[PDB]
Amino acid sequence: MADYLISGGTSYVPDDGLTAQQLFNCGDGLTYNDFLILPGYIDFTADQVDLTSALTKKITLKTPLVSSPMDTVTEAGMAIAMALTGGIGFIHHNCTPEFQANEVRKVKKYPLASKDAKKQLLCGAAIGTHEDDKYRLDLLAQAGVDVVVLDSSQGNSIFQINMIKYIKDKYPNLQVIGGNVVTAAQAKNLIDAGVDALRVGMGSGSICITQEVLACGRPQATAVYKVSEYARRFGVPVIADGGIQNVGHIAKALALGASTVMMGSLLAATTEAPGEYFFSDGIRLKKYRGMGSLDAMIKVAQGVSGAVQDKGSIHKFVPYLIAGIQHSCQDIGAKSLTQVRAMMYSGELKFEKRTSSAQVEGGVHSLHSYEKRLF
Amino acid sequence: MADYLISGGTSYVPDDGLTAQQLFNCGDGLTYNDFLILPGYIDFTADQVDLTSALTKKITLKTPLVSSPMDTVTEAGMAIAMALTGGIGFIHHNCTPEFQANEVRKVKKYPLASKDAKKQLLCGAAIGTHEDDKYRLDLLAQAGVDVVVLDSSQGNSIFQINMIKYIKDKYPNLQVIGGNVVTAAQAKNLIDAGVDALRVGMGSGSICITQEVLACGRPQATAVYKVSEYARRFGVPVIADGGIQNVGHIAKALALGASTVMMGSLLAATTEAPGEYFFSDGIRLKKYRGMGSLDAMIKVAQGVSGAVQDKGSIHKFVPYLIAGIQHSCQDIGAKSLTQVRAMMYSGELKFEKRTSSAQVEGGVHSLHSYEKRLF
Amino acid sequence: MADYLISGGTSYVPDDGLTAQQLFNCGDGLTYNDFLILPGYIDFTADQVDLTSALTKKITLKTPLVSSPMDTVTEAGMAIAMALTGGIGFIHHNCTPEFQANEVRKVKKYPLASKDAKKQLLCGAAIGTHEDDKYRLDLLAQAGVDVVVLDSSQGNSIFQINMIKYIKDKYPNLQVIGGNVVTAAQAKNLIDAGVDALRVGMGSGSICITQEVLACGRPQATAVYKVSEYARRFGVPVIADGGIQNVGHIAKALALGASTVMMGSLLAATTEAPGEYFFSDGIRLKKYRGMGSLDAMIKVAQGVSGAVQDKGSIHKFVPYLIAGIQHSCQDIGAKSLTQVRAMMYSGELKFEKRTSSAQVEGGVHSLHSYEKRLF
Amino acid sequence: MADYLISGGTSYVPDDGLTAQQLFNCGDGLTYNDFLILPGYIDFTADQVDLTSALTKKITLKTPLVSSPMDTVTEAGMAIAMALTGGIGFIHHNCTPEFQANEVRKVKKYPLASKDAKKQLLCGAAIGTHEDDKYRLDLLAQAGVDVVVLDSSQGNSIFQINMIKYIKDKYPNLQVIGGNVVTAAQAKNLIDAGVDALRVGMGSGSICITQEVLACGRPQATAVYKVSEYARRFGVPVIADGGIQNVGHIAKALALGASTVMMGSLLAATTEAPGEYFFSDGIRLKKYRGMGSLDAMIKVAQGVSGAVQDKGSIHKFVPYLIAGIQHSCQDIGAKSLTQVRAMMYSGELKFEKRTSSAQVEGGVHSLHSYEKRLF
Ligand SMILES: NC(=O)c1ccc[n+]([C@@H]2O[C@H](COP(=O)([O-])OP(=O)(O)OC[C@H]3O[C@@H](n4cnc5c(N)ncnc54)[C@H](O)[C@@H]3O)[C@@H](O)[C@H]2O)c1
Ligand SMILES: NC(=O)c1ccc[n+]([C@@H]2O[C@H](COP(=O)([O-])OP(=O)(O)OC[C@H]3O[C@@H](n4cnc5c(N)ncnc54)[C@H](O)[C@@H]3O)[C@@H](O)[C@H]2O)c1
Ligand SMILES: NC(=O)c1ccc[n+]([C@@H]2O[C@H](COP(=O)([O-])OP(=O)(O)OC[C@H]3O[C@@H](n4cnc5c(N)ncnc54)[C@H](O)[C@@H]3O)[C@@H](O)[C@H]2O)c1
Ligand SMILES: NC(=O)c1ccc[n+]([C@@H]2O[C@H](COP(=O)([O-])OP(=O)(O)OC[C@H]3O[C@@H](n4cnc5c(N)ncnc54)[C@H](O)[C@@H]3O)[C@@H](O)[C@H]2O)c1
Ligand SMILES: O=c1[nH]cnc2c1ncn2[C@@H]1O[C@H](COP(=O)(O)O)[C@@H](O)[C@H]1O
Ligand SMILES: O=c1[nH]cnc2c1ncn2[C@@H]1O[C@H](COP(=O)(O)O)[C@@H](O)[C@H]1O
Ligand SMILES: O=c1[nH]cnc2c1ncn2[C@@H]1O[C@H](COP(=O)(O)O)[C@@H](O)[C@H]1O
Ligand SMILES: O=c1[nH]cnc2c1ncn2[C@@H]1O[C@H](COP(=O)(O)O)[C@@H](O)[C@H]1O
């Protein structure tokens, strides 16, 4: 009878909110803490949200947290902790090739464990783009790296396209990560070159000053939406880096179309981070450089050198991140991240822009003094 | 792997077209032959499209074609033909009450057959709104009418609300058809009164001049969309009358949210139409009056008296109408009318506005002479 | 110095007009005689405009005029005249398979000549979609047809995708024409199936009533723009049929992104058209049926049967069409049709919408009596 | 074949971003750090970007960095350093005429060297507008100044037009710099007066308070776009001053249509700056006054007096600025500044607006403490 015969299954569900296409075609450069996600319907508990998310076309992870190839964030002790909790790591290329191959060998021998066909835990390693970096890839492949990141500030070079053509005939089983891209044109110029997964976002890092120096980049959330919108046409996941201070930005990045979220500062200064601790004004903190900083080794500095206070160990930290992600996906109303992105591209999951006074009341306000403890 | 993990099930499906909400909020008064439906995907043959569509909250028909309570369109010989091919009829109230009760008795004794629980074919009968028309309803209920139409040019009266309150306590099993409404406010003021199904559209009849005389009404397709949009919130089907010359307007009316389509001129001058034929200039044609014409029996004329050439019998005519509806629902890409409306309200089924030169090339053009034969 | 150092090469060139993307995102359903092309700069004569335009991914023609597979427009005597003047023909499938294979054999044995590698003039032949039409393709391939048209009113069926998968492994050198499509979604669902060239436009034929009957289709010029916009992403030409009464609509269709223009009524009633002439009211005219008319051989009629007055022979007619196309491309300001489409997609070639009174003064007006002779 | 015959040369290149005309017609007053430039395609190294940019209609420089005629920024020791690294200087007019003529004589006798026909390095000198300043120009022409700046807060006076008419008949080979203009109307009222190059921007200086005092001016980037848009119609370069703290604003100013960038505070407190150093709270800093400050020599103050910490010498500083400009032009994707402006006015180079939270994450964030070293 009529209660099914008019529409069928779908109830009314009023039209409060903006969809993602309506939000990112107003022209404004929205970042993470500039919009938010409207809630939906809950019919499931929090702990039964599966965070299965693809890294490349062939590589699938159990949780979408991947780390960033920076010489103060990832080495072997980092990648074992990221892969052991279900993510993946990327050993930086700011060292000698035998050192990077040694560390990839170290992590590859060694619950949600993210292991390959031969039951060893996964590992990635970023390479450069210059001609001498073809020798690094042949040392990383002998140690058996599973995925490589063509680490560059600008991903639309003829050099990176030539490197992708160099990899996709000498190693047909190896997965490559093209980047960095922010616009859909340079997404096109890499997906036709054979990239298995893009890496979106330039300028919005916690240490990047390349928007302040080179006048280039774009706001982060618009990049994550408008590259993933193009990249799902060809079945290519994207990776969002930079701009993450908290678990809310991870949920926003996953909701806008990113598959995994790459984090630099939020995993910096852990126990598994390279380097060691030192004290400044009584606060235990570990230093955190950028790749384009002039502490890399007439040159321009696309980054700064700084320090971050510690946050303990990762095995007590990324459980908080994954628990925050499933609570956010509960309040959104989807049982998986795939269902989050399906509800977003289907127009069901609706967003809303957030003004400046709305931002300053979204946080902590109207208190004399507070202490913010997250877990 | 990634081909499911980004979106899942839903492919890309580019964003060509306007949805119905984007189409009917431009402000323009679009009618039937002023927009059209963009096609979709076919994975089914034409003849397996089921046209099951609700008439009221309790009454379900097998095909959405219902007839109009006009004294030159429906009597017993009409209603047996409409119910016998799966629709329903409405015996007009432009006669004495014993005549209408006699004809409803005649049709109720007497494939897709539209029969009740006691296996007799369904029948409706329109009543007035004045106080003496309470005696007509008590004669039609003794003959056992299944649904009644509160036939009025303006459906938001206190008189019609009082008649609905009079019916919904003396006959709790009887179904009522409130109308005519064109705006969502008078949809609200009847659905809270207890109407089982609305009847949308004033002024857009083939013989109505009440837009030209009383300056009231609205364009038909916008009425059918904006009342059905309100009426599906409460599980109330709507009926669209007027403006139909062809099977294309039936498909457009069903796609915009109407459940059944009421037709006056397209079933006028059939063999089962009341009256008899006469010849004028060698063309066999049967006359067709309007209810608000001054040939009803200081008064204003809300209708004209005219004539329509014949179209044979209904049992060879409504097979053409239902075959046109399933071909249109094939080209749209939905297996049922319920799926058509679900794709429309879900934003999947997309429309496009059509300009004046687009209308004049949509029909027949650039020929010396042609003959248009439909079946 | 500064006259080159500010911009370089590009002069000012003020911003009068609308680009094609700005024109076909206002939402309106623009057809051919509803907009027009703003002129540009001339630095070349008319006769040195080359009309080289691709039919499929592999087939290239010398002039973009192709004919339509209709049983009153194309047979062998038509296809020899179309191929002999540089176009191509498509022998209709409204006959027995041995008759169509015989006529394709007849045209394949037999200046701008459009010939293959073996120096015989090209020929196409439309096939159906049903299972028994697999036997027609194997008879047309023995006679050596160069391209086939999957002739259908709706090109997004599972049946046509299955036919394309059936052709693209049994005949890897054969070219297929998918259609008919009007929206970019069904362009996607065929280009991934392996179509070499799309055929855009439904409803806008000179004899189609399928917008008036099945409530489906879209205005023609918006279809030609929005499918070619999607189809040039994958290097797939499109073919525009219907809506052409004159050489102006051919120039508008080629400017919006179509590569070749398929014409039904404008080549009907020629000397090379099938059938024979007859007189009605003293005018020599030849009949012209539609495929969906009920004169094909419970069924709906998607077309009408009519007649067109004669226009002589093609060898005196298509020189007028190609001369009109190069005069239009002169006034636009591009030396080739490829340069027309490059100027259109680059935003250089600008358009302007045209209102109803602008249409009625664009034609002939303010005269007592006139005679319109075109060549 | 078809891969060239549809469009030709131009690939798809999706439509992500806003062009400059779409950006500066939203009405908002965008400045430098309020939008940014989307990247493009790289097929060239950084060091082969030529920064050849015109100063006037006749004067061409090798790098677009010019200095500002302020009595604490430019004297002879400044202009030799600016011209020696390829730019040009402007000796201020806040002194006696014999002193300015002496210093212009000093700089004119005395790699990318910016030299005239007689192989001496170029020099400019600003003059006033009052009647006694006609005597300054006749002393500067005897020492042989190559270009003069009519230094004024408002460039649309009858006084400055009379001075331009006074110069362009007594010195037909001398180049004049009209300014300051911010709107296209006062660009028109000077270009018809005979200006060889405009000087755009009022109020947006690092020491100007004339927006806070005289309620006049406009945001800087909109001025640089909307005067250069008018000025390239007549082949007139523009010079952008004020609002520059970094090399990113230089790249944004050059991308919006400026030919050279005039900088006041970014070259203040160098070794070649006039005056001498002093210490305040342990930081070596040199004072930096404004021309409209009441330290010029009932009057209103259009400027403030302040101080800037040192940045070393220019011969180690402007190599950083030019290296930042060619890295920015690499990431944009153009081999020259002329190609940057050609891609901008052609609609190829696309921009994007940047919100407030996008600005606060574009810089350094989420760190405990950092040190920002640029080279
Ligand atoms: N958030 C971001 O995306 C971002 C932004 C800025 C910097 N960074 C980091 O800063 C690091 C350095 O940035 P980068 O791109 O300048 O490093 P890079 O060494 O890859 O680039 C150096 C320059 O050389 C050019 N190049 C590439 N291949 C070349 C070749 N064969 N020959 C000559 N030149 C070649 C590049 O165009 C570039 O201008 C990167 O590792 C990146 O991770 C990241
Ligand atoms: N397409 C349309 O919707 C449309 C438009 C115009 C006319 N019509 C047809 O024309 C016919 C006549 O139209 P109508 O509405 O004027 O018929 P009606 O007899 O119902 O209305 C007559 C007038 O009396 C008023 N009325 C209702 N109840 C009353 C009561 N107890 N006491 C006093 N006045 C009362 C009504 O407001 C109306 O002004 C209708 O049967 C209708 O079918 C239809
Ligand atoms: N301008 C246009 O695009 C246009 C519009 C209308 C009609 N036409 C012409 O009208 C002709 C007839 O139109 P048509 O599409 O109905 O012809 P058709 O025979 O191809 O279609 C007949 C119906 O059968 C279905 N079909 C396809 N394959 C099938 C299969 N194996 N089994 C069962 N059903 C199958 C189709 O969906 C369709 O509903 C066409 O040749 C076309 O050229 C063209
Ligand atoms: N970013 C900027 O554009 C900006 C803004 C404010 C101030 N400034 C600086 O401040 C300095 C002083 O500004 P200013 O324009 O007031 O200096 P000014 O001496 O040129 O102007 C003084 C006033 O006299 C008027 N004037 C010009 N010629 C005159 C004449 N023959 N007779 C009488 N009056 C005449 C002017 O209109 C002005 O009101 C300028 O050197 C300028 O560089 C720059
Ligand atoms: O030196 C730099 N300048 C600008 N961006 C950088 C630099 N080094 C790394 N990045 C990017 O910053 C990301 C991490 O930033 P974060 O997550 O904000 O801390 C990395 O994944 C890189 O993409
Ligand atoms: O007299 C009248 N004036 C205006 N509308 C009328 C009149 N009589 C009937 N109608 C309406 O016209 C509809 C049928 O019109 P048609 O389908 O266009 O022929 C009926 O269902 C009534 O709603
Ligand atoms: O029967 C029909 N109904 C609707 N469209 C048709 C029919 N037959 C052919 N067509 C289309 O009409 C086109 C030619 O129409 P014309 O060029 O306007 O004369 C053909 O190429 C077909 O795509
Ligand atoms: O006194 C003043 N008030 C406002 N603007 C000034 C003044 N003096 C100089 N300017 C402008 O400020 C520009 C330099 O400012 P800056 O580059 O922001 O440091 C100069 O080129 C002048 O156009």
Numbering used by the authors:
A (entry chain B), B (entry chain G), C (entry chain H), D (entry chain A): 1 to 110, 234 to 420, 437 to 514
Lines from the paper:
The enzyme IMP dehydrogenase (IMPDH) catalyzes the first committed step in guanine nucleotide synthesis. IMPDH forms stable tetramers, each protomer consisting of a catalytic domain and a regulatory Bateman domain. The enzyme converts IMP to xanthosine monophosphate (XMP) and requires NAD+ as a cofactor for a complex multi-stage catalysis requiring rearrangements of active site loops that close around the substrate upon binding, and then must reopen to allow release of product. Finally, we show that filament assembly tunes sensitivity to GTP inhibition by stabilizing a conformation that reduces affinity for GTP.
The complete image processing workflow applied to this dataset was also applied to the two single-substrate datasets. From the ATP/IMP/NAD+ data we resolved many different structural classes, three best-resolved of which were: the filament assembly interface, and two different reconstructions of octameric filament segments. We determined the structure of the ATP/IMP/NAD+ consensus filament assembly interface at 3.0 Å resolution. This D4 symmetric region is composed of two symmetrically opposed catalytic domain tetramers. The interface between tetramers is formed by the 12 amino-terminal residues of eight protomers, which each extend from the core of the molecule to bind one catalytic domain on the opposite tetramer, in a shallow surface groove formed by a short helix (476-485), two beta strands (51-63), and two short loops (355-360, 379-380). A key tyrosine/arginine interaction (Y12/R356’) anchors the attachment; mutation of either of these residues to alanine was previously shown to abolish assembly, both in vivo and in vitro. Residues 1–7 make mostly hydrophobic interactions with the catalytic domain, and an embedded arginine (R480’) is positioned to hydrogen bond to the I6 backbone carbonyl. These interactions are reciprocal - a protomer extends its N-terminus to a partner and receives the N-terminus of the same partner, creating four pairs of symmetrical interactions at the interface. The overall surface area buried by a single interaction is 2,300 Å2, with a total buried area of 9,200 Å2 for the multimeric interface. There is strong density in the both the IMP and NAD+ binding sites. We have modeled these ligands as IMP and NAD+, however because the enzyme filaments were actively turning over when flash frozen, we have likely captured a mixture of substrate-, intermediate-, and product-bound states.
